[PDB]
Amino acid sequence: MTEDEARRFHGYFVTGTLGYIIVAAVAHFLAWQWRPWF
Amino acid sequence: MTEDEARRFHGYFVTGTLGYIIVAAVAHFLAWQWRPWF
Amino acid sequence: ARVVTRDVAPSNANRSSVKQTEWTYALMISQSRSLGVNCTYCHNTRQFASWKEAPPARVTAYHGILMLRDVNQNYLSPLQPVYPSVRLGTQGDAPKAQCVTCHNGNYKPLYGAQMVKDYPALWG
Amino acid sequence: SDIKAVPADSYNGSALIPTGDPMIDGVGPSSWANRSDTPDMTFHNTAKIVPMRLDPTYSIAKGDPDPRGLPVVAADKQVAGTVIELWVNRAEPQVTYYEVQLTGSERRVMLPAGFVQWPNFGLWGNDKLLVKAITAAQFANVPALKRDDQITLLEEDMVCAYYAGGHLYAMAERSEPII
Amino acid sequence: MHRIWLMFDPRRVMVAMVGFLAVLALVIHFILLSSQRYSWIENGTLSAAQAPVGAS
Amino acid sequence: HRIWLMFDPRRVMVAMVGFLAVLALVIHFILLSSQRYSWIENGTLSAAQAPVGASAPAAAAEMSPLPPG
Amino acid sequence: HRIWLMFDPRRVMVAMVGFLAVLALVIHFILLSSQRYSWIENGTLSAAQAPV
Amino acid sequence: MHRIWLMFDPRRVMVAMVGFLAVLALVIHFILLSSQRYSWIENGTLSAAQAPVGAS
Amino acid sequence: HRIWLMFDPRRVMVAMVGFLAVLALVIHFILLSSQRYSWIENGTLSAAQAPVGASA
Amino acid sequence: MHRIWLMFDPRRVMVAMVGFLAVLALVIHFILLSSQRYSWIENGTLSAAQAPVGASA
Amino acid sequence: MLEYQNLFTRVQVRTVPEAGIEIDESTGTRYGTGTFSYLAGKFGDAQIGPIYLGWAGVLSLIFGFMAFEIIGLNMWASVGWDPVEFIRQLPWLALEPPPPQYGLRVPPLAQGGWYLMAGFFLTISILLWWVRVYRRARALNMGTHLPWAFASAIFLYSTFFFQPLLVGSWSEMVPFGIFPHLDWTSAFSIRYGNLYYNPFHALSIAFLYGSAVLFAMHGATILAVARLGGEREIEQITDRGTAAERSMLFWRWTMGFNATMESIHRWSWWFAVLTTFSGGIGILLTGTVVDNWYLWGVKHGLVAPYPAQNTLTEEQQQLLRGRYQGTAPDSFPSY
Amino acid sequence: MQYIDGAQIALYAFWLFFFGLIIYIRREDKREGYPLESPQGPREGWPAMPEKKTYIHRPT
Amino acid sequence: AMLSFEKKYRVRGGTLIGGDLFDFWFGPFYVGFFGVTTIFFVTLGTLLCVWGAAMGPTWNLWQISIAPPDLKYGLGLAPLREGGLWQIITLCALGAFGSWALRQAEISRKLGMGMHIPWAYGGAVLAYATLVVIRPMLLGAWGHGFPYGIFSHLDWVSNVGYQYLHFHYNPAHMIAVTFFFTNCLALAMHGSLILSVTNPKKGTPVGTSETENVFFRDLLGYSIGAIGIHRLGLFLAVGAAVWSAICIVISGPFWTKGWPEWWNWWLNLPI
Ligand SMILES: CCCCCCCCCCCCCC(=O)OC[C@H](COP(=O)(O)OCC(O)COP(=O)(O)OC[C@@H](COC(=O)CCCCCCCCCCCCC)OC(=O)CCCCCCCCCCCCC)OC(=O)CCCCCCCCCCCCC
Ligand SMILES: CCCCCCCCCCCCCC(=O)OC[C@H](COP(=O)(O)OCC(O)COP(=O)(O)OC[C@@H](COC(=O)CCCCCCCCCCCCC)OC(=O)CCCCCCCCCCCCC)OC(=O)CCCCCCCCCCCCC
Ligand code: BCL
Ligand code: BCL
Ligand SMILES: CC[C@H]1c2cc3[nH]c4c(c3C)C(=O)[C@H](C(=O)OC)c4c3nc(cc4[nH]c(cc(n2)[C@@H]1C)c(C(C)=O)c4C)[C@@H](C)[C@@H]3CCC(=O)OC/C=C(\C)CCC[C@H](C)CCC[C@H](C)CCCC(C)C
Ligand SMILES: COC(C)(C)C/C=C/C(C)=C/C=C/C(C=O)=C/C=C/C(C)=C/C=C/C=C(C)/C=C/C=C(\C)CC/C=C(C)/C=C/C=C(\C)C(=O)O
Ligand SMILES: COC(C)(C)C/C=C/C(C)=C/C=C/C(C=O)=C/C=C/C(C)=C/C=C/C=C(C)/C=C/C=C(\C)CC/C=C(C)/C=C/C=C(\C)C(=O)O
Ligand SMILES: COC(C)(C)C/C=C/C(C)=C/C=C/C(C=O)=C/C=C/C(C)=C/C=C/C=C(C)/C=C/C=C(\C)CC/C=C(C)/C=C/C=C(\C)C(=O)O
Ligand SMILES: COC(C)(C)C/C=C/C(C)=C/C=C/C(C=O)=C/C=C/C(C)=C/C=C/C=C(C)/C=C/C=C(\C)CC/C=C(C)/C=C/C=C(\C)C(=O)O
Ligand SMILES: COC(C)(C)C/C=C/C(C)=C/C=C/C(C)=C/C=C/C(C)=C/C=C\C=C(C)\C=C\C=C(C)\C=C\C=C(C)\C=C\CC(C)(C)OC
Ligand code: HEC
Ligand SMILES: [Fe+3]
């Protein structure tokens, strides 16, 4: 792995991380409407 | 590891550490608003 | 004090815990030590809940428990307001009796000595 | 008839009686397997069992007797020679063989460490080696090696088999019932 | 930021992260299942006002 | 900084992350077992209704049969 | 400073961090198990209402 | 009297000394903590007159 | 002073400090386990008020 | 598309699936046999109306 | 006198310590250089060599030490922080599970919360250690037999979590304590009607004794042919010598059948694994499928008859009836 | 059903697994010294001797 | 039928009793004088076990029980109905177990082997002899032995264990259990270790002795020897049986009260 290879992997990783967090944010908001925990 | 490599790691480590502590301080502010412990 | 299920399959009829079994185990350890005997004096330990496989003494032992509940509740405990403070416990209750009060570590009290037969005022 | 043994009688399941001297012909407890005629190698393609004189990084741990120059008492209670060099296992550091020079020298033989016992189980004075498997005379018929610095698995089996076979063939009494 | 992948192998980090997330998700789901308020398999049809609440 | 010359960052990061993981799990678990901060069951209560001063070593009965499952 | 020649700083600081972490955990645990300083439940009480 | 540092290694003495002192300090602190008179976590605010005394 | 030629001072010092330290802890712990000399609790009592064992 | 058999050995795969299918079939049959509604060895002659039903709450 | 029994080593060699076969060191490394123990070399190998530490090992140590600290601190608090009582009563001290009435809900911290937290950390530590064992095996290009042998023991360990969850209460869990976990063992056998009549329990007994028998037999066999070179089992497996032949022949003449130098280790592996596997199955079936193993054994013809030791009249049958155990009295009555 | 219960089913599944395992291990036991020599000819018990197994050695 | 390398090993000599009369092989088995003695005791003991089953109420394998005599017979030979049959079977078992050990010594002598196997087997025989000979003699009756039945002898173990109200608190029993548990763990480790080297990751060469020692040093920081593991396995397995014999022989002959009460000595140390 070179520095350019690390750059290319990092772009996919942050997008996959961001997509995971966003979908979890929708799941938490759906659960809040159903049964709020606060 | 060279001295320059240690310098580059230290800058990211310090910024990441302090930023993590600030995020935890905001979480403690939100918890205090909800149910204070003192 | 029963903790053993009378079925092959579990049901809601018995929901005893392991902790309650430990409690019964401690109580029966005390009972065994109060008479100088072991488990097998009253049980076939292959099935603790069986009375047919157990020696007759178990029946006797059960009656002892009942007798204690009649001696402690109706005679020893109500004597609370009569004793001086030095005779009571830290909660201010009257002294109570157990199996070792009569048995003192023997299968029979005083090794089965018979005395009350010569004292008609003592047997009702 | 390539095993040099004959059945006792004509009933099947009967035991074989060796024809010659079973120590050398390799019969019964003196039998050896036809292993490979190549030396065993360590993890780095070097001879596994070598004499100490080929590797001076090996030594004897403190508090352990140096068996070199010590007499070798055989089953006759007669000295059969003197230990002069140790053969060690380099894969797992341990003494594997002792090299014994005979009383009238003129030859050197190997002695596996498994047949070596020390006096008083090695608790009191360790001034000699006990070899209960072989007699002082049969030390001269131990098979030799092709080289003076490495030992192949084929000969390794032969030396061990020869010594182990002498618990039944060293003397006529050892192959007889006690009662 | 991307230089973290030179210090740490992405193959090892990704496998460890997936194992950590899978265990965390199972633990949180199981904790909610074992509780009274969020045992959704049995009482998931109750409204928010009907759901159990811990004692004051 | 010269501390990373003495300690390999690869080795320290794993120990640091593991320590934070254990500490965060310990605190979240302690709060879950308390009466005042058992947020999964009582998170909807206001600050006035939340339990106070409930150390109570024998807060609950120790000996009982299992619930009717 | 000459102590750092006698003792390896790497091993000293690892043993120092480990010792202090255990000590901090032990003290925080003792206070949590006590009645007066069970701050998770008692924290909002004033000093006069704290157990003695 | 400085010659003992040639008989005994100073580095090994300091480690053994610190280890023994740390263990001793913990034992004394915890012996007092478990006593009625010197709990000091529960009863530290009591005056010396109010502190418990063993029975005569 | 000729004992130190027959006996090695280094191991004698270690065995002497080890034995005395263990013996001191045993005596201190035996007294702490008794009633008359449980000084952590009853150390403020006078000699007249200190407990005395059972008599004949 | 048959090139999947060039990535997984047909002989090993079909033995694994035959074994897994047999275990699954036995597990399902034995779970039904242990139930109240589908203990067909004993109550298989009952009509659908007479078959046991779990408690309604 | 007696021959050399190959029980101890009198002459030990010393060389430079084995650093170790080169392995990938990106996520871990070897610590120490390798020392020699004179006492250990008498019995086995003398080298107290370097130990490998990586991600899984460090995380496992952290989690396991957290669990150990929680257990020890709760034990110490249970005696009032007395160090003398802590050492004196250490076998009897415990970290107890939650009360039964809480079911699977979170207990109070002083009444079972610490127990669940310590159990969680111990489980995480055990799983991380399994990962470490797997990585250590595959770093040296070895087969993964030890990881699955360890997984069997982990399965038995995890039945102590799954059975209480299947019956529906954390109170049924094993307390952390030397004498208390034996108390739990006894009470668990009593509660479910004489675990001797659990068939998988008997199977695990059979495999435990079989493990002892197999190790005694294999150890004696290898020590008996160690003078022929039998302790070098890899060589006797890839190139069968006279030691392997003599072992095979001894056991064939004694028993009528034998194993090889390789397959005897398969026997050993499977006996040791089946011990914990059958034990875990037996624990899983208890309290969920069968509630009284003696009555199950009577059902399936396992219980031998004895003459009756007592008989009861009908009024005795009604009177000797008892009550199932309930809650403890929360009041002190005045009579 | 009534007489058949889960413990019995699990026990018999374990019995089948154990018998299969014993067959496999007995097959592995016959990788050295086989086939047997008898006056009547070659002999193999049940299970039959498996195929020849070859190892792999490091290059020199 | 013989193994392909077996013929050259089948030689005379090595027996302790007898000559060429008892120096033959019956099939794969070697028959010595103690082979003949083994068959006599095995046949007599098994036939008397079958007779005991026929005297009892059932032919069910799990429920067959041949029980020892009553305690009132006190080291005598009871009537065969009343437990005397158990005593006869016990003598046959002792003779068969002893003959089996001596037959094993003859076989190892013929093969030029050590005597480890007979002595390792003697640990199991010692435990059995303690259960039915030594402890009953110390207690004064043969009726203290365990019955001969698959599940009947489990009932004896349960009741005897509860004769001391908690058998887990027996100090020798605690040690013996540790020996059994450690032996099983060590056997799993040893079996895995040999198999992992001999059957390595697919496509890689078979490992060496260095691979084992390196692996266990990487995992645990210490690697016992190739001979060390076999010494340890012998010690753990045999020591488990020896500590088992101690644990049962001290219950009754030496300690009669409950085992929890034995720990008074630890609680009453002067410190
Ligand atoms: C709950 C958690 C518990 C606790 C946790 C339990 C977990 C599971 C454990 C299962 C047993 C493991 C035994 C063992 O030795 O493991 C170490 C081995 C290491 O292998 P490796 O490191 O990957 O590589 C080493 C390998 O090269 C050599 O391995 P070794 O020889 O030592 O043993 C592996 C195999 C033997 O290998 C061969 O036979 C291959 C030889 C060449 C091909 C053979 C000819 C072609 C055949 C084609 C048709 C055949 C194709 C398969 O040994 C085994 O796998 C064990 C065999 C004995 C056990 C089974 C006996 C029969 C049982 C059924 C009886 C039914 C009734 C009659 O690791 C493995 O994974 C081995 C491969 C296992 C294959 C079977 C997997 C079954 C999974 C079942 C569940 C799957 C999800 C539903
Ligand atoms: C889990 C899967 C695997 C499960 C299975 C695991 C198996 C493990 C073992 C593997 C091998 C098994 C095969 C085997 O042993 O074969 C031996 C023999 C072939 O032998 P051979 O090679 O031809 O014999 C060589 C050699 O001995 C030649 O000597 P010779 O031919 O002169 O034989 C002389 C012997 C035999 O003469 C006899 O009278 C002995 C008869 C023994 C059987 C009948 C017993 C009842 C009558 C008793 C006699 C009555 C008066 C004549 O003479 C001897 O003295 C030889 C030694 C005998 C034992 C020592 C002396 C004892 C004296 C005291 C006790 C006396 C009896 C109470 O071949 C066969 O017998 C063929 C059949 C093999 C399969 C077994 C069949 C069993 C059927 C009945 C099953 C009953 C189940 C409950
Ligand atoms: C209350 C439950 C019901 C019932 C409900 C069902 C239902 C519903 C189904 C079955 C199925 C099957 N049941 Mg059922 N079954 C009952 C009672 C029985 C009894 C009995 C003693 O009473 C028996 C012996 C069977 C036996 C069977 C098998 C014939 C079959 C599963 C095959 C298999 O192993 O696939 C797993 C096997 C493998 C993975 C490997 C082997 C594959 C081979 C090819 C199987 C051949 C079987 C058959 C001929 C399939 C056609 C193959 C093609 C011709 C190539 N059932 C009761 C009355 N049973 C299933 C089925 O497939 O039926 C056809 C199914 O869907
Ligand atoms: C009165 C008591 C009961 C009884 C109750 C039980 C109960 C209850 C159980 C057993 C079980 C077992 N019993 Mg039983 N048992 C009795 C009588 C006997 C007798 C006898 C002489 O009569 C014998 C020989 C046995 C023997 C056995 C074993 C075969 C079996 C355990 C296997 C094993 O390896 O466990 C030891 C192995 C493990 C626990 C595996 C897991 C180990 C883990 C991975 C270790 C992690 C350690 C960690 C890293 C370090 C410590 C960390 C700190 C804690 C912080 N029992 C009687 C009838 N027995 C078990 C079983 O399987 O039953 C079916 C079981 O649960
Ligand atoms: C085949 C079944 C048998 C089995 C198998 C088995 N066990 C195994 C393995 C295998 C095949 C492994 O590979 C694995 C292993 O690595 O063994 C060396 C393991 C293992 N079996 C273990 C134990 C074990 N096995 C047991 C049983 C058995 N193991 C079965 C009989 C038992 C019993 C009888 O109860 C125990 C206790 C471990 C040695 C090990 C798994 C190690 C593990 O998971 O560790 C996790 C790490 C921690 C919990 C951290 C602990 C931290 C310390 C407690 C604190 C230290 C503080 C201070 C520095 C020192 C304090 C000293 C005091 C603690 C003394
Ligand atoms: C119940 O009470 C208790 C439980 C106790 C309470 C406690 C709660 C606690 C403490 C929670 C902790 C939460 C936590 C910790 O920080 C949570 C942290 C969460 C995080 C960070 C999640 C991150 C997820 C990231 C994902 C999914 C990324 C996926 C990326 C992908 C898929 C990229 C694919 C593309 C590639 C690979 C490119 C190909 C290769 C190419 C091109 C190449 O090579 O070129
Ligand atoms: C009962 O109650 C109880 C529970 C007991 C009470 C509790 C009490 C206790 C004892 C609490 C303890 C608290 C504690 C202890 O000190 C708390 C200490 C906390 C600490 C220190 C937190 C530090 C966090 C640091 C972080 C997150 C850093 C992240 C760094 C990042 C992201 C940068 C890395 C990326 C790089 C470098 C990429 C460039 C690479 C480059 C360029 C390259 O590679 O080249
Ligand atoms: C019921 O209660 C129970 C308990 C049962 C009843 C009990 C009963 C029993 C059995 C009691 C036994 C008591 C006992 C036995 O005799 C007690 C014996 C006590 C003794 C002997 C004590 C001696 C102590 C001496 C010490 C500490 C000396 C230290 C010396 C130092 C520090 C100086 C060294 C420094 C040097 C030299 C530097 C110069 C170096 C130089 C020049 C150089 O480097 O060269
Ligand atoms: C119920 O049972 C119960 C109640 C228990 C009842 C049972 C009771 C029983 C059985 C009692 C038995 C008692 C007993 C048996 O006889 C007791 C026997 C006691 C004896 C023999 C004690 C001997 C002590 C000797 C001493 C202290 C010697 C000191 C020597 C010194 C100091 C000189 C050192 C010189 C050195 C080092 C070098 C100088 C030379 C130099 C330098 C040079 O040479 O240069
Ligand atoms: C000064 O000294 C200090 C205090 C600093 C350190 C000293 C410590 C000492 C002396 C410690 C002593 C420890 C001892 C003696 C421990 C004894 C342990 C024994 C004998 C244990 C035996 C058995 C225990 C078992 C089998 C426990 C099993 C527990 C399990 C499987 C628990 C699982 C729990 C889980 C998975 C929890 C999950 C949490 C959630 C919330 C997800 O579910 C409830
Ligand atoms: C005679 C004095 C006995 C001794 C000795 C032992 N037990 Fe017992 N047992 C006895 C009685 C009278 C009862 C019933 C008491 C009641 O209030 O109902 C019992 C009961 C048990 C049980 C519960 C059985 C059930 O069906 O759940 C158990 C598990 C038990 N006993 C065990 C036990 C143990 C472990 C003993 C020695 C420590 C022991 N028993 C001795 C009478 C007597
Ligand atoms: Fe082996």
Measuring CA to CA, how many Å separate C41 from each of C32, K89, M71? 9, 31, 16
**What Cα–Cα distance (Å) separates residue H34 from each residue in I40, K112, M86?**
10, 23, 60
CA distances from I45 to C86, H31, I27, I38, K244 (A): 24, 19, 21, 11, 79
A28 labeled part of a ligand binding site? yes
- Bridge partners of K95, per DSSP, are K176
> Residue D165's closest CA among D175, D151, D150, D179?
D175
Torsion, CA D86, CA D89, CA D94, CA D97, rounded to 10: -40
Look at residues K29, M74, M58, I1 and name the one whose alpha carbon lies nearest to residue M66. Answer: M58
For residue K150, what are its two tokens?
A: 């360890």
Which of K61, K60, K197, K170 is closest to K113 using CA atoms? K170
Question: Which experiment gave this structure?
Answer: cryo-EM
Neighbours of K144 (CB within 10 A): 17
Q: Residue holding tokens 């039928």?
A: M1
CA nearest neighbour of K168 among F69, F61, E35, E27: F69
In Å, how far from its chain's centre is CA E48? 21
Q: Give Cα separations from B7 to B1, C121, F3 (angstroms).
A: 10, 102, 10
Where would I find the H helices in J1-57? 10-34, 40-43
Q: Say how far apart CA H14 and CA E46 lie, in whole Å.
A: 67
Token pair 């809940």: residue: C49
Distance CA K213, CA K207 (A): 10
- For residue K231, the Cα-to-chain-centroid distance in whole angstroms is 27
M203: helix, strand or coil: coil
In DSSP terms, D131 is beta-bridged to D116
Ligand 3 atom having least distance to the Cα of J29: 2
C52/K308 touch (CB, cutoff 8 Å), yes or no? yes
Alpha carbon K222 to its chain's center: 26
Strands D5-7 and D16-18, bridge-based pairing: antiparallel
φ/ψ of M120, rounded to 5, equals: -65, -40
Other C-beta atoms closer than 10 Å to the C-beta of K191 total 27
The closest of M204, D168, K255, G12 to L59, measured between CA atoms, is M204
| C-alpha–C-alpha distance, residues K79 and K164, integer Å | 28
Q: Three-state DSSP class for M255?
A: strand
Q: What is the resolution of this structure in A?
A: 2.3
**Closest chain L residue by Cα to residue J37:** L1
CB-CB under 8 Å, G30 with H42: no
Smallest Cβ–Cβ distance between F63 and the set C12, C15, C20 belongs to C20
By C-alpha distance, which of C69, C49, C67, C71 is closest to C58?
Answer: C49
Phi, psi of K216 (to 5 degrees): -60, -45
CA distances from M8 to D25, H13, K142, M23, M51 (A): 11, 67, 37, 15, 44
Gap between the Cα atoms of M173 and M181, Å rounded: 12
Q: Is the peptide bond before L50 cis (omega within 30 degrees of 0)?
A: no
Rounded to whole angstroms, the Cα distance separating C117 from M205 reads 92
Strand L41-43 vs strand M24-26: parallel, antiparallel, or unpaired? unpaired
SS3 K103: coil
Tell me which residue of L2, D137, D98 sits closest to C9, measured CA to CA: L2
| Cα of E17 to nearest chain F Cα, Å | 12
The one-character DSSP state at M130 is: I
**Cα(H45)–Cα(H41) distance, integer angstroms:** 9
Which residue among K3, K229, K242 sits closest to D132, beta carbon to beta carbon?
K3
Phi, psi of H45 (to 5 degrees): -85, -10
Nearest chain A Cα distance for residue F56, angstroms: 26
Cα(K225)–Cα(G43) distance, integer angstroms: 72
Helix (H, G, I), strand (E, B) or coil at I14: helix
Amino acid making up residue B18: L
> SS3 string of chain D?
CCCCEEECCCCCCECEEECCCHHHHCCHHHCCCCCCCCECECCCCCECEEEHHHCCCCEECCCCCCCCCCEEECCCCCEEEEEEEEEEECCCCEEEEEEEECCCCCCEEEEEHHHEECHHHHCCCCCCEEECCCCCCHHHHCCCCCCCCCCEHHHHHHHHHHHHCHHHHCCHHHHCCCC
d(CA M215, CA D170): 43
The CA-based diameter of chain K, rounded to the nearest angstrom, is: 87
- Do the beta carbons of residue L44 and residue L30 sit within 8 Å? yes
The residue whose CA is least distant from atom 15 of ligand 10 is: K177
Tell how far the Cα of M6 is from the centroid of ligand 5, in angstroms. 43
Residue tagged 């633990």 (tokens)? E27
Q: With H, G, I as helix, E, B as strand and everything else as coil, classify residue I27.
A: helix
Which two tokens mark G22? 């255990």
CA angle K195, K199, K200 (to 5 degrees): 90
Q: Could you write out the three-class secondary structure of chain K?
A: CCCCCCCCCCCCEECCCCCCCCCCCCCEEEECCCEECHHHHHHCCCEECCEEEEHHHHHHHHHHHHHHHHHHHHHHHHCCCCHHHHHHCHHHCCECCCCHHHCCCCCCHHHCHHHHHHHHHHHHHHHHHHHHHHHHHHHCCCCCHHHHHHHHHHHHHHHHHHHHHHHCCHHHCCCECHHHHHHHHHHHHHHCCCHHHCHHHHHHHHHHHHHHHHHHHHHHHHHHCHHHCCCCHHHHHHCCCHHHHHHHHHHHHHHCCCCCCCHHHHHHHHHHHHHHHHHHHHHHHECCCECCHHHHHHHCCCCCCCCCCCCCCHHHHHHCCCCECCCCCCCCCCC
List chain M residues with CB under 8 Å of L36: 1-4
Asked if K260 and L31 touch (Cβ cutoff 8 Å), the reply is yes
Closest CA to D13 of M34, M107, M22, M35: M22
Structure tokens at M36: 């003949």
The DSSP code for M86 is: H
With beta carbons less than 8 A apart as the criterion, state whether M245 and M127 touch: yes
Q: Alpha-carbon distance I8 to H8, whole Å?
A: 13
Q: Is M30 helix (H, G, I), strand (E, B) or coil?
A: strand
Pocket of ligand 8 (CB under 6 A): H 1, 3-4, 6-7; I 20, 26-27
Answer for the pair D144, D45: CB distance below 8 angstroms, yes or no.
no
- Is any ligand 6 atom within 6 A of the Cβ of residue A29? no
Report d(CA L28, CA L31) in Å as an integer.
Answer: 6
Closest CA to K278 of K186, K207, K211: K207
The CA M27 to ligand 2 mean position distance, Å, reads 7
| G35–F52 C-beta distance less than 8 A | no
Report the half-sphere exposure of K201 (CA within 13 A, side-chain side).
Answer: 19
CB M30 within 8 A of CB M108: no
CB of E53 closer than 6 angstroms to any ligand 7 atom: no
Burial state string for M69-94 with b = 16 or more CB within 10 A and e = fewer than 16: beeebeeeebebeebbbbbbbbebbb
Radius of gyration of chain M (CA): 24
User: What is the CA G18 to chain-centroid distance, rounded?
Assistant: 12
Helix (H, G, I), strand (E, B) or coil at C99: helix
Is A27 marked within a binding site? no
Angle at K330 between CA K325 and CA K333, to 5 degrees: 105
**Chain K closest-CA separation from residue E31 CA (Å):** 8
Length of chain D: 179
Distance CA I45, CA D115 (A): 74
Residue written as token pair 């030691």: K243
Number of residues written out for chain E: 56
CB M95 within 8 A of CB M37: yes
* Number of residues assigned to chain F: 69
- Per the rule left: phi > 0, alpha: psi between -120 and 50, beta: everything else, K19 is alpha
H27 part of contact set with chain K, CB < 8 Å: yes
Instruction: Work out whether strand K28-31 and strand K51-54 pair parallel, antiparallel, or are unpaired.
Output: antiparallel
Distance CA M210, CA D43 (A): 7
Query: Hey, what are D149's tokens?
Result: 């610095």
Mutate which of K146, K185, K186, K188 for ligand 4? The one with the most ligand atoms within 8 Å of its CB, which is K185
Query: Using only C-alpha atoms, what is the Rg of chain I?
Result: 19
The values of phi and psi at residue D126, to 5°, are -100, 90
**How far is Cα M235 from Cα D136, in angstroms, rounded to an integer?**
35
Q: What is the DSSP letter of K95?
A: B
Distance CA D31, CA D168 (A): 12
Tell me the CA distances in angstroms from C12 to C15, J54, K26, K322, one per residue in order. Answer: 6, 16, 56, 17
Dihedral, CA of residue D85, residue D90, residue D96 and residue D102, to nearest 10: -20
